[PDB]
From a paper:
To gain further insight into the arrangement of these domains, we solved the structure of EXTL3ΔN by single-particle cryo-EM, producing a high-quality Coulomb potential map at 2.4 Å resolution. We then built and refined an ab initio model of the 170 kDa globular domain of an EXTL3 homodimer. In each chain, we were able to model two partial N-glycans at Asn592 and Asn790, respectively. Detailed analysis of the globular structure revealed that it is indeed composed of four glycosyltransferase-type domains, with one GT47 and GT64 domain provided by each chain. Within each chain, the GT47 and GT64 domains are connected by a linker region of 124 amino acids. The GT64 domain and linker region appear to contribute the most to the homodimeric interaction, which appears to be stabilised by a pair of intermolecular disulfide bridges between Cys793 and Cys915 in the GT64 domain. In spite of this sequence conservation, the GT47 domain of EXTL3 exhibits several unique features that point to a loss of activity in this particular enzyme. For instance, the side chains of Glu453 and Arg421 are engaged in a salt-bridge, which would direct Glu453 away from making interactions with the substrate. Moreover, our structural alignment revealed that, in contrast to other GT-B structures, the EXTL3 Cα4 helix exhibits an extra turn at its N-terminus that occludes a putative phosphate/donor sugar binding pocket.
Heparan sulfate is a highly modified O-linked glycan that performs diverse physiological roles in animal tissues. Though quickly modified, it is initially synthesised as a polysaccharide of alternating β-d-glucuronosyl and N-acetyl-α-d-glucosaminyl residues by exostosins. These enzymes generally possess two glycosyltransferase domains (GT47 and GT64)—each thought to add one type of monosaccharide unit to the backbone. The HS chain can be initiated from the tetrasaccharide linker by EXTL3 or (in some cases) by EXTL2, which add the first α-GlcNAc residue (GlcNAcT-I activity).
Author numbering:
A (entry chain B), B (entry chain A): 176 to 349, 374 to 557, 582 to 858, 869 to 919
Write the structure that this text describes.
C-alpha cells in the first residue's frame, strides 16, 4: 500500500523553497455541479485567501482537488469519478503529490471513494474503512459544520462550574451492545449520580452506517442536552472494519464545542488529526470490556484535572475544528510537517515613517526553523497558539547552560567579572545572566500631548541599552513642521497610524528590531535605574510581563461577577502596560491570533487594552506577572466602570478567568543590605 | 491479527487491583539450558527484585516467559520451541496475557520466533519482520548490553563543547545505496566540515541480516570514534519488509551512550519504545530521498537545540536503555500503561520514634492516579524522573482558576477579605493565593548539640502554620532520659537514624504529613515573619527551592573548572538548605532516583548535601532558586575546598552544570512603601 516514502516525490519539495500549493478550480470539472453548494463556497473562499496557494502549476509541491460531499442522492458513478480524476491536467500518470479532499457536512452515509482507484494520491475525509485507510499517508479530518457561518463564543457555556446537572449523557439508536446497555441502565437506575442515557431517538434518527449508533434529532436538539452534561459518551461502531465514521466525528465536534468531555468506548477508532494531537489530554478513551468500570473512573477524577481537560478540548476545537479555514490549514500543515517543511513567516506591520527634524544591535531572527516544525512537534501542535505560523523570535527558546559560554559558545555573552562574579561595579559593567547581550526598544503612544512628548523623549537621553524609540502617532492631524524633536542619541521613528486605536501600541511594527519592548505612556516618569533593573529581570523572565504599575481583580459576592480594583494591596494580578516590558511575540499574538471581539471592544470603549494583554499573557503561560519596584504612582468614573465591564466580557470570551495572584515583588539582591566596606550595592536606590 | 482489544483478557486485570506479574522459572523448561548464561543471570536477578512480581499464579494479570537469546549455533528447533510454549502450566489454550521476552546480547542474526506460533501472546524483542510485528500489541525493546555489569558515567564524554572533532561519522559494510554513498563521499571530499565515513570495515565485520549494514569491529572500537563525533549516522536496511533490526538498535544504543546525536536515514523504521517516546526530541529522522540535504540541515541547527537533543538522549538512555532492570521495568510499564493501570506507590522511609518526655491538618494523598498514567502520558514518559513510580504529591499538579473557589470548588480555600482583597489586616488573616490552605513541617538535623537544640525548638513556639517538628537524631548515642523537651504546641517526633549521614535530612520520613518541608539547622535564628512570608512565596512557587542563604558558582579561567563562592554578590545560583522550603517530592527523588555516586560522595566528605539538592532541583526544573529576604547571616578551610571538589564531581556525574543565575530577590508588595493612613503594611519588617 502507498506510504509517504514510496508514493511521494520529494524532488518537487525542497526544504528551503517553501510549500507552494496549487488548487484546482472544481467548476471546470464534472465534480463542480454535483458538489454541495455550501461546502464548495466555503472551500473556494478559504483557498482564495490562503498564503501557501499559487496559480503557477509548474512550481507546486502539492495539488489539491475538492470532490467534496455531493448532493443526495449521488448522481455520479464511481467509475466516472475515477475517469475524471485520471484526466486532471497535472495528474501525470498516477496522481503523485495530490490530495483528494472530501468534506462531510450533511450526510453521514456517503462513502464516495470506496470503489475508486486513487493511484498515489492522498485522501482527506471523515469516513474510512480498513481496506482504504493508509496510516501516515491518509488524513482523518473533521466535518464542516460552520460553513458560511461563524461560531460565536457567547453561546458556549462557561467552563466553571466543573460539575453540571448530568454526569454523562447519551442519545442514539441502533459483541458488547447488551453489556453496555445493561451497565449504563443500571447506572441510571442506581441514581448515585444524575445521568440521562437514551438508546432510542425521540426525534426521527438520521441515516447511519450499518453498525453505527445513529444521531438523534437536529443539531440544536443535541447541544441543549450536551450543555448540561459534564461528560459526553461516544460509543464506537460494532463493525471491526470501520476505522472512523462521520457520525462519531460529529459527536466529538458537538461535545468539544460546549465543553462536555468526551468519553470514547473503543480503542480501535482513529480520531481526527490523531497523528499530531494527543487526544488523551482532552478525551477519555476506554475499552468496551471496561464499561463496568466507567462510573467509578468518572467519579474518581479531580475537579482541576477535569477542568484542564475541558480547557484543552476548547483549545483543540477552536484551533482545528471550528471553521473551514481551520480545517484547510490543518490539512496543509499536516502534509507540510510530514515532509518536514517549515511554516510560512507571520506578517509584520509595515508602516510609513513621518519625517521630522531633530550602537544599536539587532537581535537575530529565524534561527529555529527545522527545530520548531519537527523537534518541538508536541509543543507546536498541543499548545497555544498552534503550528500555523513561524515567528522570528520566541520567549520559550532553550537557554544554554552556564558552562557553554566559556567552552565554545561564548559569542555575544558578557559575563560579570569575566566569570568570577563580583559586587556593584562588576554588576554595572556587564549584563550577565543566562543569555547573550541584548537591547530593548521603547514604544510610545501619543495623542494631543505634543509638548509632554518632547519632555519625556528628552528624559530618555542616555539610556544604556536603548536601541531606538518608536513614537506611534495616533492623532488625525500630523505633527507640525516647526516641532523640533530632541537629539537623545538614538533614532526616533514616528510611525503613521491608519486609524486611531489603542490597539496600535501592540502592533508588531517593522521598525522594532529587538525582542524586548518597553511600553511607556508619553507622560510617565521613570528613573534610568528602574528601567535597567526591570530589563535585567525581564531578561531572566522573558515570557512574563515585567512592569511597575500593579492592579488586582476582586469578586463581587452580591452579583457573582468580577471587579477591577486599584487600591493599595498586598497581592496583585495585573501589571499595566503603561510602564512594562514584554516580548514582541505577544504583539504578533495580540494583533493576529487573539480573538477579534476583544480588539473590537477595546475600540468601542477606547479603553482596556492593558487588561486584554494581561489576559492574553496569563492565558498563554498560566503564570502571574512580575512587579518590579516599590512605587505605585508615576507622575474619570466612567473610565473606571468601563473596566469592570471589560473584565466581565473578556471572561465571557475566554470562557474562564485566566488571571492569577502574586503576593510578592522583586528587588535587587543587595537592596537595603549592610555591606562590608569593600563591597558595593548593585543599585544606589533600587 | 491479534490486537489488545481482541486478544487480551481484561477480566484478570481490574484497574484498582494493582499489576501482579508471574514470571516462569526458565530453569524448569527446555529453554533454560540453551539460554545465553549472562542474559539468563541478569534477567533472573532483576525479576527476583521487582516489586510487581508475585509467586501466586492464580491472581496474576500477566505471565512472563524468557526464551531469550540462545547460544550459537541454535540447537533448538522452531517446532520444539512451539511445543514447549504450548505446554506451559498456565498457557491455558492460547497463551492470552503472556509476554514472550527474547533479549539480544551477542547475535544480530538470530530470529528464533519467525516460524513459531505464539497464539495470543505478546512478543518483546529487538528484531521484527512486517509479517510478525503487530503494532500496539508487540514491543520493540533495546538490546541487553550491560549484563552483569555497570555503566559508569565517568567514561561518558561531557555534553559541552557542542561541536566535536567530526560533524558526523559512519562505519559499516554491506534503492538508494549508491546515491547515499556518493553524496556522503562528496561531503567528505569537499571538506567544508570534518567527517569520517567508511563503507568497508577495517576490523572484521559482524554477521548481519541479508540487506543490513554490518557492524564493524568490537564495541570498544566503535565508541572511540563515536566519542569524537557531534552526530552519528544510522542507515536503515534496504529490505522493505524489515521493520527493525538488532544492529540498528545497537547503533542507536552506542550513539546515545556517548552523546552523539543519531541521524536516521529512513522513516519506515520502528525505534524502541516508539509508542511512548518522542524520538524526534532526541534524534533526527530523515527520508533517504533527502540525503542530499542532510549536510545543510546538520549545519543549520543551533548549538542550544543540539545540546537539548543531546541532553534528552542522555535522559532516555539512562532511564530506559542502560541496564537489564531498566529494560524489564520499561516492558512492564508499557504493558501496564496500555491497559491503563497506575504504577506502584513509591516506598517511604519507615522510622522508629525515640520516646521522650515533654490543629495539624494533613494534605491529601494519591488524588491523581489515572490522570498521571493516561492523561499526562507525554510528561510521564518524556520528562524526568520517568513513569516507574507513583508519588503521593507532585509540585506540578494543575491549579484551579481564580473563579472556581467561588463557583463550586471552594473546599479548603481561604481567600483574602472574602475575595474583595485588602491590606495588611486581611492579608495576615488568610493565606490567600491560588491553592487551598496548607501547613508545613520542620525537619531538623542535630548532632552533639543537645542544648542549642532545646533553645531552637523553644523558639518555634507559636508558629501559625506549623504541623509538627521532626528531629533527626544522627548521633550514635541516644538522647538522655533527663533531657526535658519543650512544649511548643505541636508534636515533636524524634526519629532514630540507622547510620550517621547528612543524607538523612532528605529522607522521606513517614512522619512528614505535609507537602512542604522547612529544612533548618539546629542553630539557625529565623524570625516568625520571615518564615511565614517564605511559606507564602513557596505556596506560589511550589517547584522551586525558596530560602534565605544564597551562594553562587564561579569559573576559574586558569584551570577551566568551577569554584564555590560565598562573598556578597549581586547574582546568585544556590540557596542552601540550612534554611529553605522545598517539596517532599524532591526528598523521594534525592533518596531513591538520584545517582548513588552523589550520595556516596556526600557520605565521604560528610559535606555538600545542600549543593547536591540544588543540582537536583535545577536539573528537574531548569530554573534558579528564589532568595527571600535581605539577610545574609543567621547566627574551616578544608570544609571550603571540599565544596569546590563536590561541585566538579557533580558536574562530572550529571554531564553538565545545571545551575542557573538569578539577579533578583523577592520582598512583600508593600515593603518600604509610603501608605495612606487607612492602609497597613503586609509585614512590619518584611
Ligand atoms: C477600593 O476598594 C473598595 C472596596 O473593595 C472599592 O469599593 C467598591 O467598588 C465597587 C465598584 O464601584 C462596588 O461594587 C459596585 O457597587 C455598585 C453599587 O454601589 C453596583 O451597582 C455594582 O454592580 C455593577 O457592576 C457589576 C460588575 O462589577 C455587575 O455585575 C452588576 O450587575 C452591576 O452592573 C458593583 O457591585 C463596591 O460596592 C465598593 N465597595 C465598597 C465597600 O465601597 C473601590 O472601588 C476601590 N477603589 C479603587 C480606586 O479601586
Ligand atoms: C571571595 O571571592 C574571591 C575572589 O573570587 C575568592 O578568592 C579566590 O578563591 C579561589 C579558591 O580558593 C582561588 O582559586 C584557587 O586558587 C588556588 C591557588 O591559590 C588554586 O590551587 C585552586 O585550584 C584548585 O582548585 C580547582 C577547582 O576549584 C582545581 O581545578 C585545580 O586543579 C586546583 O586543584 C584555585 O584556582 C582564587 O585564586 C581566589 N581569587 C582571589 C582573587 O583571591 C574567595 O575565595 C571568595 N571568598 C569566599 C568566602 O567565597
Ligand atoms: C528560516 O525561515 C525564514 C523564513 O522563511 C527564512 O528567511 C527567508 O530567507 C530567504 C532566503 O534567504 C529570504 O529571501 C527571505 O526574505 C527570508 N524571509 C524573511 C521573512 O526574512 C530563513 O532563511 C530560514 N533559515 C534557515 C532555513 O536557516
Ligand atoms: C491511588 O493509588 C493509591 C496507591 O496504590 C491507592 O492507595 C491505596 O489504596 C488501597 C485501598 O484503599 C489501600 O489498601 C492502600 O493501603 C493504599 N496505599 C497507600 C500507599 O496509601 C489509592 O486508593 C488510589 N486511589 C484511587 C484509585 O482513587
Amino acid at each position: 500500500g502507498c506510504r509517504l516514502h514510496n508514493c511521494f516525490d520529494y524532488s518537487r519539495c525542497p526544504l528551503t523553497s517553501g510549500f507552494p500549493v496549487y488548487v484546482y478550480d472544481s467548476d471546470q470539472f464534472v465534480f463542480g455541479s454535483y458538489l454541495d453548494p455550501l461546502v464548495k463556497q466555503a472551500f473556494q473562499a478559504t483557498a482564495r485567501a490562503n498564503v501557501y496557494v499559487t496559480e503557477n502549476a509548474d512550481i507546486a509541491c502539492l495539488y489539491v482537488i475538492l470532490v467534496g460531499e455531493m448532493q443526495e442522492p449521488v448522481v455520479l458513478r464511481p467509475a466516472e469519478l475515477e475517469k475524471q480524476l485520471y484526466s486532471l491536467p497535472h495528474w501525470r500518470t498516477d496522481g503523485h503529490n495530490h490530495v483528494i479532499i472530501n468534506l462531510s457536512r450533511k450526510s453521514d452515509t456517503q462513502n464516495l471513494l470506496y470503489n475508486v482507484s486513487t493511484g498515489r494520491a492522498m485522501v482527506a475525509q471523515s469516513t474510512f474503512y480498513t481496506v482504504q485507510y493508509r496510516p501516515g499517508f491518509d488524513l482523518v479530518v473533521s466535518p464542516l459544520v460552520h460553513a458560511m457561518s461563524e461560531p460565536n463564543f457567547m453561546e458556549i457555556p462557561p467552563q466553571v462550574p466543573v460539575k453540571r446537572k448530568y454526569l454523562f449523557t447519551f442519545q442514539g439508536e441502533k459483541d458488547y451492545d447488551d453489556r453496555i446497555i445493561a451497565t449504563l441502565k443500571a447506572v441510571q437506575d442506581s441514581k448515585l449520580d444524575q445521568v440521562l442515557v437514551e438508546f432510542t431517538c425521540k426525534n426521527q434518527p438520521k441515516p447511519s452506517l450499518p453498525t453505527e449508533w445513529a444521531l438523534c434529532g437536529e443539531r440544536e436538539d443535541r447541544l441543549e442536552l450536551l450543555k448540561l452534561s459534564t461528560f459526553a459518551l461516544i460509543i464506537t461502531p460494532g463493525d471491526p472494519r470501520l476505522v472512523i465514521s462521520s457520525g462519531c466525528a460529529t459527536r466529538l465536534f458537538e461535545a468539544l464545542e460546549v465543553g462536555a468531555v468526551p468519553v470514547v468506548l473503543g480503542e480501535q477508532v482513529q480520531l481526527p488529526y490523531q497523528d499530531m494531537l494527543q487526544w488523551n489530554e482532552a478525551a477519555l478513551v476506554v475499552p468496551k470490556p471496561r464499561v463496568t468500570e466507567v462510573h467509578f473512573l468518572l467519579r474518581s477524577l479531580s475537579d482541576s484535572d477535569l477542568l484542564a481537560m475541558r480547557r484543552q478540548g476548547r483549545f483543540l476545537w477552536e484551533t482545528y475544528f471550528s471553521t473551514a479555514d481551520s480545517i484547510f490549514n490543518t490539512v496543509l500543515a499536516m502534509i507540510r510537517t510530514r515532509i518536514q517543511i517549515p511554516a510560512a513567516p507571520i506578517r509584520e506591520e509595515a508602516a510609513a515613517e513621518i519625517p521630522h527634524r531633530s550602537p544599536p544591535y539587532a537581535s537575530p531572527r529565524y534561527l529555529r526553523n527545522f527545530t520548531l516544525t519537527v523537534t518541538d512537534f508536541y509543543r507546536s501542535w498541543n499548545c497555544a497558539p498552534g503550528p500555523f505560523h513561524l515567528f522570528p523570535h520566541t520567549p520559550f527558546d532553550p537557554v544554554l547552560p552556564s558552562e557553554a559560554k566559556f567552552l565554545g559558545s561564548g559569542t555575544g555573552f558578557r559575563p560579570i567579572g569575566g566569570g568570577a562574579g563580583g559586587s556593584g561595579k562588576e554588576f554595572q559593567a556587564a549584563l550577565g545572566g543566562n543569555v547573550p547581550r541584548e537591547q530593548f526598544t521603547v514604544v510610545m503612544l501619543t495623542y494631543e500631548r505634543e509638548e509632554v512628548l518632547m519632555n519625556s523623549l528628552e528624559r530618555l537621553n542616555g539610556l544604556p541599552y536603548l536601541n531606538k524609540v518608536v513614537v506611534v502617532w495616533n492623532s488625525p492631524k500630523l505633527p507640525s513642521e516647526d516641532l523640533l524633536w530632541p537629539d537623545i542619541g538614538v533614532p526616533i521613528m514616528v510611525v503613521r497610524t491608519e486609524k486611531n486605536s489603542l490597539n496600535n501600541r501592540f502592533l508588531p511594527w517593522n521598525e522594532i528590531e529587538t525582542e524586548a519592548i518597553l511600553s511607556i505612556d508619553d507622560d510617565a516618569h521613570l528613573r534610568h535605574d528602574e528601567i535597567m533593573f526591570g530589563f535585567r529581570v525581564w531578561r531572566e523572565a522573558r515570557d512574563r510581563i515585567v512592569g511597575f504599575p500593579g492592579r488586582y481583580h476582586a469578586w463581587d459576592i452580591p452579583h457573582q461577577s468580577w471587579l477591577y480594583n486599584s487600591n493599595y494591596s498586598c497581592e496583585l494580578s495585573m501589571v499595566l502596560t503603561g510602564a512594562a516590558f514584554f516580548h514582541k511575540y505577544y504583539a504578533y499574538l495580540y494583533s493576529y491570533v487573539m480573538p477579534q471581539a476583544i480588539r473590537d471592544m477595546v475600540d468601542e470603549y477606547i479603553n482596556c487594552e492593558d487588561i486584554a494583554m494581561n489576559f492574553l499573557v496569563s492565558h498563554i503561560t498560566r503564570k502571574p506577572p512580575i512587579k518590579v519596584t516599590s512605587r505605585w504612582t508615576f507622575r474619570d468614573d466612567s473610565h473606571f466602570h468601563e473596566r469592570h465591564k471589560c473584565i466581565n466580557f473578556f471572561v465571557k470570551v475566554y470562557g474562564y478567568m485566566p488571571l492569577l495572584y502574586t503576593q510578592f515583588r522583586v528587588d535587587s539582591v543587595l537592596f537595603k543590605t549592610r555591606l562590608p566596606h569593600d563591597k558595593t550595592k548593585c543599585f544606589k536606590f533600587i
